[PDB]
Design a protein around this ligand. Structure first.
Ligand SMILES: *[C@@H]1O[C@H](CO)[C@@H](O[C@@H]2O[C@H](CO)[C@@H](O[C@@H]3O[C@H](CO[C@H]4O[C@H](CO)[C@@H](O)[C@H](O)[C@@H]4O)[C@@H](O)[C@H](O[C@H]4O[C@H](CO)[C@@H](O)[C@H](O)[C@@H]4O)[C@@H]3O)[C@H](O)[C@H]2NC(C)=O)[C@H](O)[C@H]1NC(C)=O
Ligand SMILES: *[C@@H]1O[C@H](CO)[C@@H](O[C@@H]2O[C@H](CO)[C@@H](O)[C@H](O)[C@H]2NC(C)=O)[C@H](O)[C@H]1NC(C)=O
Ligand SMILES: *[C@@H]1O[C@H](CO)[C@@H](O)[C@H](O)[C@H]1NC(C)=O
Ligand SMILES: *[C@@H]1O[C@H](CO)[C@@H](O)[C@H](O)[C@H]1NC(C)=O
Lengths: 102, 132, 128, 39, 112, 132
């Protein structure tokens, strides 16, 4: 089975800054998807195929990396973006990192 | 800079200009002449009418001395009963649409004259080549 | 647009069997797969299985076999051929199975696997 | 009116039995750009 | 009139980092003859403007690969790859597709 | 004997060979380019797409200096911004499919350059013929 490990756990910041999110796989040569779930809402898609964007996603969301390392860098943090962020490869999900205000 | 959109006109661009400025760019009307379950047959009978009337003009051009040269002199003299105009005017006085009214009776006499003036020139080229 | 409307929340007993509708509308239902994702607290997301609703070919998870069954019902009228409904019969519940159940769908995206799910359901919470 | 009681019939039932219009299609106008063919 | 907008207003660039100056027209600038009629000019303050990039994604006879032209219809980007001391000045976007010729508002680049 | 099936290849025969051996036989790809109640309309829209895209290549060829000559020199110089390769390699080092990737940005600049270099040469032939 592919297992996915999210690094930072709780990443606390302030709005306006830039956060990175590093997710580590266990099988190289695949895609990646990044799911954002706010508090008490329906989750939404951000990234697929490690680089592209969903329908109606601002261009401050960008993800890169290949092999077994995959980064999701968010520039110019809003107040809405403090949510849980999920990795997903083929069926397996990460446990989810959390963004909190400072 | 070099390369501007002023003198680089488009399709039918010089359609009111004189003949001496319309014969400067003839290729622009030339290249936009072939390319650009019942409404597919409105597509078929629009396409095979375009490639047919293009080949018809390439055949009347072909059996004269002009294969694809697009400007070519010939050998028939210009009888003044056709046009009776001066030469020094009709390259900077008139325009092409004013010319097409002025001559339209006398086509199919010129088109018949051009074929015989080519085929006489064609076999006479062979008789020059045959003796040597 | 694409809309996936689920069913309301339920209260079940250990040993019962839920049934969670997922009515799809706004796209041709005979083309795109429908998956089912269960979200458990303290465990993250978890997959269940898809249903290719042209014929109804399903495939479940390995640890949920024998306890899940997904059927579908198409739209057999030419006056309205887009809508449809997927189902899920989750049998043999447990107090360790109380979670939120989502029906998803892939995106009409063509550089895009079956798993990057674009449009989601509203979410059905199930308490045991 | 077919002519107590009062019983009617459809008006087009004389001389022209005619179709429904499928509610999938719509009678809204969309723009149409007429184009000339080549030449 | 067609609008030529230039982004950004002014850039303070480091020598070596790839710089980008973008300009957007009101419509596409591809002509049927085969050339894209979007140009780029360099101007020093107190100096007449000089042409840099004509027929974009092709360099001129005298400029190196420090300048580049790319983009598509209605979106034009001038990319300055390697910055020298002489790279400072005001850049202009200008169309030679239609009449009249409209110019950009001006993009000043200075030294740090 | 004389006449063997070894060097007498077929359609797309030298498709991996170098350009100096592919330009030896160009006629074999040339002649198999035109010849070879609803599935008759799949026959019609397959035929009039074949004769249309053949005439389109015979028109872009025609308005340059090359009527049917199939190999022809021209007058435009080769700017090294296009290819920047040596001459002594690209007739025995590369192959044609490797060339078509190496140049595909710079077509429609060459095709635009060729028409103006012909029409300038066309009327200048007439101005030489007109004074004498
Ligand atoms: C299942 O397996 C298949 C194949 O086995 C994978 O499909 C390939 O996926 C990769 C990566 O997603 C694709 O590579 C991408 O190609 C795009 C198109 O490039 C075309 O043109 C080039 C040049 O001619 C060809 O070499 C190429 O083969 C394509 O024909 C590019 O636009 C992509 O670049 C973008 O993404 C990368 C990485 O994000 C960035 O670095 C770039 O800067 C750019 O943003 C990329 O190169 C490939 O085309 C797919 N097809 C094939 C046949 O290989 C699936 O991804 C895989 N699916 C899963 C879920 O695992
Ligand atoms: C078909 O039926 C229609 C409906 O009745 C006929 O129309 C009427 O005919 C009567 C004849 O007695 C007239 O008095 C009415 O004025 C008619 N109605 C209208 C609205 O005109 C029609 O005549 C019939 N025959 C045909 C050939 O159409
Ligand atoms: C062409 O002929 C008709 C009658 O045959 C005549 O009326 C007309 O004037 C002629 N055209 C010109 C340009 O003389
Ligand atoms: C053609 O242009 C594109 C961008 O315009 C460039 O990426 C590519 O390398 C070019 N082709 C060649 C062979 O240089």
């Amino acid at each position: 089975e592919i297992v996915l490990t999210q690094s930072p756990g709780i990443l606390s910041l302030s709005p306006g800054e830039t956060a990175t999110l590093f997710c580590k796989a266990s099988q190289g040569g695949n895609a990646m998807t990044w799911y954002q779930k706010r508090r008490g809402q329906v989750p939404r898609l951000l990234i697929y195929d490690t680089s592209r964007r969903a329908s109606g996603v601002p261009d401050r969301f960008v993800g890169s990396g290949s092999g077994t390392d995959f980064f999701l860098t968010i520039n110019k943090l809003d107040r809405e973006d403090f949510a849980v962020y999920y990795c997903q490869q083929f069926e397996f999900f990460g446990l989810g990192s959390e963004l909190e205000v400072h | 800079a070099v390369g501007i959109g002023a003198v680089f006109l488009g399709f039918l661009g010089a359609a009111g200009s004189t003949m001496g400025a319309a014969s400067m760019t003839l290729t622009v009307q030339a290249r936009n002449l072939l390319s650009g379950t019942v409404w597919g047959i409105k597509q078929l009978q629009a396409r095979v009418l375009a490639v047919e009337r293009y080949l018809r003009d390439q055949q009347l051009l072909g059996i004269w001395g002009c294969s694809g040269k697009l400007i070519c002199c010939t050998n028939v003299p210009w009888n003044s009963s056709w046009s009776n105009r001066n030469l020094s005017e009709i390259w900077d006085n008139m325009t092409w649409l004013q010319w097409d009214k002025e001559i339209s009776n006398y086509t199919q006499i010129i088109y018949g004259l051009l074929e015989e003036s080519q085929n006489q020139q064609e076999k006479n080229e062979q008789d020059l080549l045959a003796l040597d | 647009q694409v809309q996936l409307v689920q069913s309301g929340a339920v209260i079940k007993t250990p040993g019962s069997s839920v049934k969670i509708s997922c009515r799809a509308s706004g796209y041709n239902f005979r083309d795109y797969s429908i998956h089912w994702v269960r979200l458990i607290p303290d465990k993250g997301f978890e997959w269940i299985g898809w249903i290719k609703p042209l014929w109804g070919a399903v495939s479940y998870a390995r640890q949920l076999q024998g306890r899940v069954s997904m059927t579908r019902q198409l739209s057999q009228d030419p006056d309205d051929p887009d809508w449809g409904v997927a189902y899920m019969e989750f049998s043999g519940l447990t107090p360790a199975d109380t979670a939120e159940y989502f029906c998803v769908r892939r995106g009409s995206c063509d550089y895009c696997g079956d798993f990057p799910w674009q449009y989601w359901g509203q979410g059905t919470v199930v308490v045991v | 009116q077919i002519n107590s009681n009062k019983e009617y019939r459809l008006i087009n039932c004389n001389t022209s039995a005619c179709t429904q219009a499928c509610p999938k299609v719509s009678f809204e106008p969309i723009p149409i750009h007429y184009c000339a063919p080549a030449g | 009139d067609i609008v030529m907008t230039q982004t950004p207003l002014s850039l303070s660039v480091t020598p070596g980092e790839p710089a980008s100056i973008s300009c957007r027209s009101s419509q596409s600038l591809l002509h049927s003859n085969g050339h894209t009629y979007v140009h780029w000019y360099l101007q020093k303050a107190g100096q007449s403007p000089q042409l840099l990039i004509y027929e974009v994604s092709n360099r001129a006879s005298g400029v190196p690969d420090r300048f580049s032209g790319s983009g598509s219809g209605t979106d034009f980007t001038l990319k300055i790859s390697r910055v020298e001391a002489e790279d400072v000045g005001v850049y202009y976007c200008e169309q030679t597709l239609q009449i009249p010729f409209t110019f950009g508002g001006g993009t000043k680049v200075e030294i740090k």
